[PDB]
Design a protein around this nucleic acid. Structure first.
Ligand SMILES: [Mg+2]
Ligand SMILES: [Mg+2]
Ligand SMILES: [Mg+2]
Ligand SMILES: [Mg+2]
Ligand SMILES: [Mg+2]
Ligand SMILES: [Mg+2]
Ligand SMILES: [Mg+2]
Ligand SMILES: [Mg+2]
Ligand SMILES: [Mg+2]
Ligand SMILES: [Mg+2]
Ligand SMILES: [Mg+2]
Ligand SMILES: [Mg+2]
Ligand SMILES: [Mg+2]
Ligand SMILES: [Mg+2]
Ligand SMILES: [Mg+2]
Ligand SMILES: [Mg+2]
Ligand SMILES: [Mg+2]
Ligand SMILES: [Mg+2]
Ligand SMILES: [Mg+2]
Ligand SMILES: [Mg+2]
Ligand SMILES: [Mg+2]
Ligand SMILES: [Mg+2]
Ligand SMILES: [Mg+2]
Ligand SMILES: [Mg+2]
Ligand SMILES: [Mg+2]
Ligand SMILES: [Mg+2]
Ligand SMILES: [Mg+2]
Ligand SMILES: [Mg+2]
Ligand SMILES: [Mg+2]
Ligand SMILES: [Mg+2]
Ligand SMILES: [Mg+2]
Ligand SMILES: [Mg+2]
Ligand SMILES: [Mg+2]
Ligand SMILES: [Mg+2]
Ligand SMILES: [Mg+2]
Ligand SMILES: [Mg+2]
Ligand SMILES: [Mg+2]
Ligand SMILES: [Mg+2]
Ligand SMILES: [Mg+2]
Ligand SMILES: [Mg+2]
Ligand SMILES: [Mg+2]
Ligand SMILES: [Mg+2]
Ligand SMILES: [Mg+2]
Ligand SMILES: [Mg+2]
Ligand SMILES: [Mg+2]
Ligand SMILES: [Mg+2]
Ligand SMILES: [Mg+2]
Ligand SMILES: [Mg+2]
Ligand SMILES: [Mg+2]
Ligand SMILES: [Mg+2]
Ligand SMILES: [Mg+2]
Ligand SMILES: [Mg+2]
Ligand SMILES: [Mg+2]
Ligand SMILES: [Mg+2]
Ligand SMILES: [Mg+2]
Ligand SMILES: [Mg+2]
Ligand SMILES: [Mg+2]
Ligand SMILES: [Mg+2]
Ligand SMILES: [Mg+2]
Ligand SMILES: [Mg+2]
Ligand SMILES: [Mg+2]
Ligand SMILES: [Mg+2]
Ligand SMILES: [Mg+2]
Ligand SMILES: [Mg+2]
Ligand SMILES: [Mg+2]
Ligand SMILES: [Mg+2]
Ligand SMILES: [Mg+2]
Ligand SMILES: [Mg+2]
Ligand SMILES: [Mg+2]
Ligand SMILES: [Mg+2]
Ligand SMILES: [Mg+2]
Ligand SMILES: [Mg+2]
Ligand SMILES: [Mg+2]
Ligand SMILES: [Mg+2]
Ligand SMILES: [Mg+2]
Ligand SMILES: [Mg+2]
Ligand SMILES: [Mg+2]
Ligand SMILES: [Mg+2]
Ligand SMILES: [Mg+2]
Ligand SMILES: [Mg+2]
Ligand SMILES: [Mg+2]
Ligand SMILES: [Mg+2]
Ligand SMILES: [Mg+2]
Ligand SMILES: [Mg+2]
Ligand SMILES: [Mg+2]
Ligand SMILES: [Mg+2]
Ligand SMILES: [Mg+2]
Ligand SMILES: [Mg+2]
Ligand SMILES: [Mg+2]
Ligand SMILES: [Mg+2]
Ligand SMILES: [Mg+2]
Ligand SMILES: [Mg+2]
Ligand SMILES: [Mg+2]
Ligand SMILES: [Mg+2]
Ligand SMILES: [Mg+2]
Ligand SMILES: [Mg+2]
Ligand SMILES: [Mg+2]
Ligand SMILES: [Mg+2]
Ligand SMILES: [Mg+2]
Length: 203
RNA sequence: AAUUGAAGAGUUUGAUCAUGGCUCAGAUUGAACGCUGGCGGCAGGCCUAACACAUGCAAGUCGAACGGUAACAGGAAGAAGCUUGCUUCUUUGCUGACGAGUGGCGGACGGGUGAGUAAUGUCUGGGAAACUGCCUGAUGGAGGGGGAUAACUACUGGAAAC
RNA sequence: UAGCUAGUAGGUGGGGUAACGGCUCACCUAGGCGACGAUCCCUAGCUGGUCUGAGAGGAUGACCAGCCACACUGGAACUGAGACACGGUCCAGACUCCUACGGGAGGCAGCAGUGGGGAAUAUUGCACAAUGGGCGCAAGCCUGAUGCAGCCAUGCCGCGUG
RNA sequence: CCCGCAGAAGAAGCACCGGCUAACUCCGUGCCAGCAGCCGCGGUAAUACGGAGGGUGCAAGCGUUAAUCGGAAUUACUGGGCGUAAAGCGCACGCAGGCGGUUUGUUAAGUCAGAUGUGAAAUCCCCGGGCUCAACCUGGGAACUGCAUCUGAUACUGGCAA
RNA sequence: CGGCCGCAAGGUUAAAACUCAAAUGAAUUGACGGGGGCCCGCACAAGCGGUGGAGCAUGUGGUUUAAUUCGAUGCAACGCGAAGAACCUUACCUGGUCUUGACAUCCACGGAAGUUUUCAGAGAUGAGAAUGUGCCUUCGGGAACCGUGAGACAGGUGCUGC
RNA sequence: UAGUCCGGAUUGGAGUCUGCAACUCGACUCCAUGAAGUCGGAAUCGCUAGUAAUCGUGGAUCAGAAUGCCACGGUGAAUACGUUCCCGGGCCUUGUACACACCGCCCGUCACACCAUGGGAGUGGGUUGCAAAAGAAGUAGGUAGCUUAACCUUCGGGAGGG
RNA sequence: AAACUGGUA
RNA sequence: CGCGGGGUGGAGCAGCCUGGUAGCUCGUCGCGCUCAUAACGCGAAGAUCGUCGGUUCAAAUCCGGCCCCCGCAACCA
RNA sequence: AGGACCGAACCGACUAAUGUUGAAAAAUUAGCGGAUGACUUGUGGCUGGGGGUGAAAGGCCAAUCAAACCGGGAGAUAGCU
RNA sequence: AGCCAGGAUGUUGGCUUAGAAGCAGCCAUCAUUUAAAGAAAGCGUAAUAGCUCACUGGUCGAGUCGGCCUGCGCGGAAGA
RNA sequence: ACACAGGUGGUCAGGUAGAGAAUACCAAGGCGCUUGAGAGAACUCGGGUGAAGGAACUAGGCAAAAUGGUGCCGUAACUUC
RNA sequence: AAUUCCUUGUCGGGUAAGUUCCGACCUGCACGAAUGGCGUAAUGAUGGCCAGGCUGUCUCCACCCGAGACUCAGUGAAAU
RNA sequence: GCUCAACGGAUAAAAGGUACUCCGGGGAUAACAGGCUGAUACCGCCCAAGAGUUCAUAUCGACGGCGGUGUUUGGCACCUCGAUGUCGGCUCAUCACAUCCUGGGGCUGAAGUAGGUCCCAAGGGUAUGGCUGUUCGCCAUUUAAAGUGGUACGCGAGCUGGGUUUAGAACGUCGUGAGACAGUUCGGUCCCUAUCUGCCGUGGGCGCUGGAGAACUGAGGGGGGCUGCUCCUAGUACGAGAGGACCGGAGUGGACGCAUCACUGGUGUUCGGGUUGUCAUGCCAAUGGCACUGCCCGGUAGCUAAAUGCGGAAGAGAUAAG
């Protein structure tokens, strides 16, 4: 929800801008005008915009001293425009910004378990051979045993022989330590991936 | 004539008496809100932001203090196209008056507010070392001179204010 | 909140005010206030009165009347009998407005009225006919004081809805 | 303010009904929905919730909320308490402070008596008068319980002397 | 929290927000006590015979079933209601039937009651043939009883033993 | 002196009998088979005299049904020293924070939710003490600079003002 | 010798 | 190829110089005790001695193989 | 009074620059610490090497110290260059 | 292979359609009329239309089309 | 090792200013340091000044710059007072 | 944390931006009580961080004063 | 009679530390750098299921395949152990193009503006800070852009010394201990006068055919080449609107470079003045020396930046992609 507190100089302007803003309401995100009025921005308008995280917009009006008191004390998003199209552009920008970042995954590593070992803190650690890609320190992982998901989490411990490492490229041996992954069995595959964003926008 | 003045109840316990709190019945208000609403008389009406203000009005008056004709309500002279003796038009302060100016009185009253002030203010009761426009009583003067300035004219700076 | 005060308390002389006075200076003394509450901190205009109560007391100071303080904020003085002056002056400050960008103006806590705040509180009205003030010999002019009217069941009282 | 025409025509609502507290039945619901100042009602026969009928109270008003006093002798001066309900310091010595045996004299401070002055008006109260009654307005009185000065009393308290 | 005191532990002075309708003292009656005293019962002790072990009868719980009808549940339910479930009893299950009805009562019409057999069908049940057509009888009918029809009704071993 | 001439369940075959009806689901009889069971754990029950123990007979319900219920008789014991205790009950007294009356009441940590509150490195404001800098306007004091219509003058200038 | 506890209204 | 002890029922356990009916603690299913629960008591199911080969009426106790666990060595991923 | 304070002589050596075939085999310039004390200094004496001394750094013992210097075993040995 | 012509619609198939008869989209995945035509491959038209592909008629006229095996070349080919 | 910017104990110690044996200029006294003369370039060393900005420099305010005396007034948290 | 690998752990403060610093959290790889634990006024040519002043440290160097460097005369090295 | 099992059997009889170290050797053997290689990494290409509403190839692209570079992580041990100084920073650079900006084009799922992808192009240009030793990285805030790599991971006989491999000390951890950690923490000597090559400047000799003084031509070489914003065209083309051009002109900036002191300033120990202490010129007065030019205030010329003038071009020829 995008909350708007709209005050304009003329009632015709108020009633035109309200419907112009309502027309562009998308299913994913909507816009509500909690307050709509004619005249300068008042302390009541400031309080109403403080209650809900609203954008306090004045079409051809300016805040008085009393309203500016609350505006200074609590920092709200006060906006002054002179063109309905500028106001609509800003509202569309806010609506688009409110959207989700579109989390997506892609495989960047692959290892096969061999020669299970033991550890005091993490319990049973897996001695993996990286077959393709790269495996990083703290990235989400998926354990597959015969192409069926067994474990979902994040790679916690990654060292070689004796030294902790941040990454291991394909072709080297590595040790993977996940305390909750206690059913370590030879032949298991581990997929490593990261998270990518596309940052959708309304259109 | 002016002193005709004083009520209790519910609630702790199985029940009782105490102690002790809470609650209610009364009166009152610069009240607000809900439902409803015919008339009249008297009174009251920003208690919060001593927060900010568009616009109009709320302190003027004296020509019987004095220079004056900027309005113009009269009159007279004169010059004139003449209604043919009655009109008109420039001077003229004689004039009923009077914009602007000097001068006198008033603007310290009336009106508004409760910020500040814990006594440097207020209430009560006293005092001595004081002034007092206008209003009133009494006793006495009110003689003779001088130099300026506003207004008004001639220039000049100004968008305005000046 | 237990200690507070150096012009501080007293005296001589000068100065100053309408008037007494550390009111102000020079000098001399070390004094003065405080447990009967000094100093410090919080709150608040005071009274006649109003409410309540049998009374004593408790709460309160809205209207009317008396006194005090203030006039956008801070400061100063002039004029005047009387001001350290609500609709005066000068300086400084915050804010607002006009500008030809050279430069200027402003003070509703006066009566109406507007924005804002709030649960909440009215007409941008008529007249100087009466009373009372300012000027004037008077006539007369001015007077949002005042007299009236408009809005509100806000209160008290009276009548009707047969 | 008086007169004339017509016509019951234009004019009644709010709260409450278990006890406190004046006023009872039915239906719906079934610890749900709801009520509630206090005690507290509602878990299938509710005088306590919702509706209807009936009744009680007030009336151009009625009810709710806010605030003060009263009831509250529940800050007890009038007018309370501390063995066990709250409440005697663990005990003692002692400054300031409070109180103090008996005889006389004196003072006259406390105390009491009389007089004078004062205690604004309005408001409160008593007797009257005017708005068609009332509210309201208004004449006189009383009160304004206080404060100051003067003149006296000397029982008691205080001071001085013995 | 602040102040003072103490090496420390801590001591002394001493609140507010918030929450409840109570908290509390003395005493009365009852109950209870791993308090005391006295007394009684096949209560214990001293004995006999048992149950709990095995087979069987019966009831109950549980389970299953179309139904396994409904009750009764520590002592004080469990050979209990039940002093007699193969039909009935018997409500419960599945099927087949009826709607003023199996039973009471009001009304109309028709028909003696009853005794004999036959078709279909598990039966109930429908569907025929028979036989019979008597007492009172005011000669339009009643009383004993049968069939059909309408409406008031009849009916419930359905729930609440709080 | 044994799983037996004890023990009788189960089971097969064959029969008697009530009743419309013995298969779900009756009683009795004849032949055959002959399980478990050789005195029974924790625990628990009745009985003090014709009692217990054991042995037969009858009745109700009922067409047909008992090891159940009710009822009659034959044979016929052991042990009770005593109230020290389990259970229950009665009376007197005592303690109680109990009164849905000990199957009462009631405490604290810990897990969850909400409300207010203390400490807290810091952050943002208001007021104010002390020590300094700062000096608009105004008032007062002092003035070799400039300027000046009222008074004086020797007419050159003085006094005084700005 | 030991001898706990008792949902709410 | 790495230093010792082991392996009894669902879990933990007794039989060692003593090779003779598989027993005891805790768990599961019952019964009793109590108004009821806990506690407590009485009972039942439950087994190649970790797994095989020599020895032997016999079974880790006399031995020899296989498998598993643990004291450390067990690297350390 | 003080293993008190500031600060010269005096005793040190924290920073920087220079120098690094130096003026010097550790110094110069500018700063810096202590400066009545566990202080500093002159003269003389004692402790001798698997030993001494050490408010401890494996520090010092004549420009040399995880075992001083001089002479000898000695032409030690060197699977090494 | 060019050029001169046909090269269409039985039938807006149902439907959509700015104005869709093959071409902006679905079902339909068939067949006559026919020298010759697929209810159609596409530019194009505010859909047809205009203009085109397959097939065939005429003019022109002798070569033309696509595979296989082979020799030598071309691109793929950026570094201090 | 040098006619070496180093080290070396004691005694005397004047004037002006100054607390002073610090520091500055002088007296008595002693010295100009055993290669010079020119020029007035990069670069190095030792110094002075610097518009506006003022740590942005750097591992780091290194180095520089800055403060600096006597008298009087005044002075916080904390504290073993 | 003079102790924490993961690690620039998370939150708050400071900045404009803070792997450093200060205050907390506790998941203490791998604190801990005379190999002392936790505090602590004063002290320190001790380690870390911040602020005022100050500045050629720096943006970005410029000019000037002396000693060398350069030229002339005398003497006259060194590593390799 | 020996698990002399290290099994041709050094003793009957035997473990460690050295960062306090020392000697003799080795590039017969590692760490830095070079060399070979190219598994890995980076870049390119082949096929095309599929995504893209329809549509493989606007943009991506599964399962698979083929190459280039020398460029990361690796392999080898060929050079250097009678010495090739190692990370980061400063100063100074130079090359490649697989192009970050600027320039020219094709395609687009390119209406305009703004974008995506590919081709040609190396002339010029290509950030300051906060934190960390930090190259990198995150963050703040700019720019037209804040390019990727080679050069002994360019550059210590140019500088630094923060990290890191000496000696001191401590924490955690391991060890009985000496001690150790590729864990942390505080402190800790950076030498060289340039012979040759090279480079930046400046001279002498001879030659060029009689000698000498001048002015030239120009084979050849070097320097330079960057770019923002505002206005007009024009609120026009394009679009429903919002918004908003190509092409072509003008003006004013940033960085960089050259020149020059007319101006604004710095310096100006060679000019004038003020002033503290002290000494001297016989003394007063007036002067001089010393104390950083004693301290300080101004300031001529010259040199200078912060000051003010100019520059990068237009044009022509032959071309790359097209
Ligand atoms: Mg007027
Ligand atoms: Mg006039
Ligand atoms: Mg007044
Ligand atoms: Mg005097
Ligand atoms: Mg006085
Ligand atoms: Mg009372
Ligand atoms: Mg009061
Ligand atoms: Mg005056
Ligand atoms: Mg006035
Ligand atoms: Mg006004
Ligand atoms: Mg007003
Ligand atoms: Mg409002
Ligand atoms: Mg009334
Ligand atoms: Mg009643
Ligand atoms: Mg009901
Ligand atoms: Mg009272
Ligand atoms: Mg009391
Ligand atoms: Mg006592
Ligand atoms: Mg006493
Ligand atoms: Mg007495
Ligand atoms: Mg008296
Ligand atoms: Mg009357
Ligand atoms: Mg009266
Ligand atoms: Mg009065
Ligand atoms: Mg007396
Ligand atoms: Mg305290
Ligand atoms: Mg008996
Ligand atoms: Mg017994
Ligand atoms: Mg039995
Ligand atoms: Mg029932
Ligand atoms: Mg039953
Ligand atoms: Mg039941
Ligand atoms: Mg039946
Ligand atoms: Mg009952
Ligand atoms: Mg038999
Ligand atoms: Mg037997
Ligand atoms: Mg029978
Ligand atoms: Mg009895
Ligand atoms: Mg209990
Ligand atoms: Mg707090
Ligand atoms: Mg002044
Ligand atoms: Mg419990
Ligand atoms: Mg000392
Ligand atoms: Mg010192
Ligand atoms: Mg040192
Ligand atoms: Mg020195
Ligand atoms: Mg010291
Ligand atoms: Mg050591
Ligand atoms: Mg030595
Ligand atoms: Mg030795
Ligand atoms: Mg020998
Ligand atoms: Mg030899
Ligand atoms: Mg050898
Ligand atoms: Mg080829
Ligand atoms: Mg010499
Ligand atoms: Mg010497
Ligand atoms: Mg000496
Ligand atoms: Mg020089
Ligand atoms: Mg220099
Ligand atoms: Mg300097
Ligand atoms: Mg100078
Ligand atoms: Mg500067
Ligand atoms: Mg400056
Ligand atoms: Mg500064
Ligand atoms: Mg930097
Ligand atoms: Mg320094
Ligand atoms: Mg300095
Ligand atoms: Mg770390
Ligand atoms: Mg900083
Ligand atoms: Mg910290
Ligand atoms: Mg430790
Ligand atoms: Mg210990
Ligand atoms: Mg030389
Ligand atoms: Mg020479
Ligand atoms: Mg030589
Ligand atoms: Mg061998
Ligand atoms: Mg060490
Ligand atoms: Mg060696
Ligand atoms: Mg080699
Ligand atoms: Mg190498
Ligand atoms: Mg390599
Ligand atoms: Mg080899
Ligand atoms: Mg090499
Ligand atoms: Mg060599
Ligand atoms: Mg290219
Ligand atoms: Mg060119
Ligand atoms: Mg390098
Ligand atoms: Mg490089
Ligand atoms: Mg080099
Ligand atoms: Mg380097
Ligand atoms: Mg270092
Ligand atoms: Mg070039
Ligand atoms: Mg010049
Ligand atoms: Mg100058
Ligand atoms: Mg000079
Ligand atoms: Mg002199
Ligand atoms: Mg001299
Ligand atoms: Mg000298
Ligand atoms: Mg060109």
């Amino acid at each position: 929800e995008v909350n708007i507190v709209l005050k304009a100089d003329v009632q015709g302007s108020v009633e035109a801008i309200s419907d112009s803003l309502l027309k562009l309401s998308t299913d994913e995100v909507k816009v509500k005008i909690i307050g709509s009025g004619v005249g300068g921005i008042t302390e009541t308008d400031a309080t109403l915009a403080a209650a809900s995280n609203a954008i306090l917009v004045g079409f051809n009006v300016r805040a008085d001293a009393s309203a500016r008191k609350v505006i200074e004390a609590e920092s709200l998003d006060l906006r002054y425009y002179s063109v309905i199209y500028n106001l609509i552009d800003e509202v569309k920008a806010a609506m688009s910004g409110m959207l989700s970042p579109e989390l997506k995954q892609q495989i960047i590593g692959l290892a096969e378990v061999r020669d299970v070992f033991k550890s005091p803190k993490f319990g049973a650690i897996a001695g993996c051979m990286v077959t393709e890609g790269v495996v990083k320190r703290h990235n989400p992982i998926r354990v597959l045993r015969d192409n069926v998901v067994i474990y979902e989490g994040e790679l916690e411990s990654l060292r070689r022989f004796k030294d902790d490492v941040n990454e291991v490229r394909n072709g080297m041996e590595c040790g993977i330590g996940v305390k909750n992954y206690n059913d370590v069995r030879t032949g298991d595959v581990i997929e490593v991936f990261e998270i990518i964003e596309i940052q959708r926008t309304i259109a």
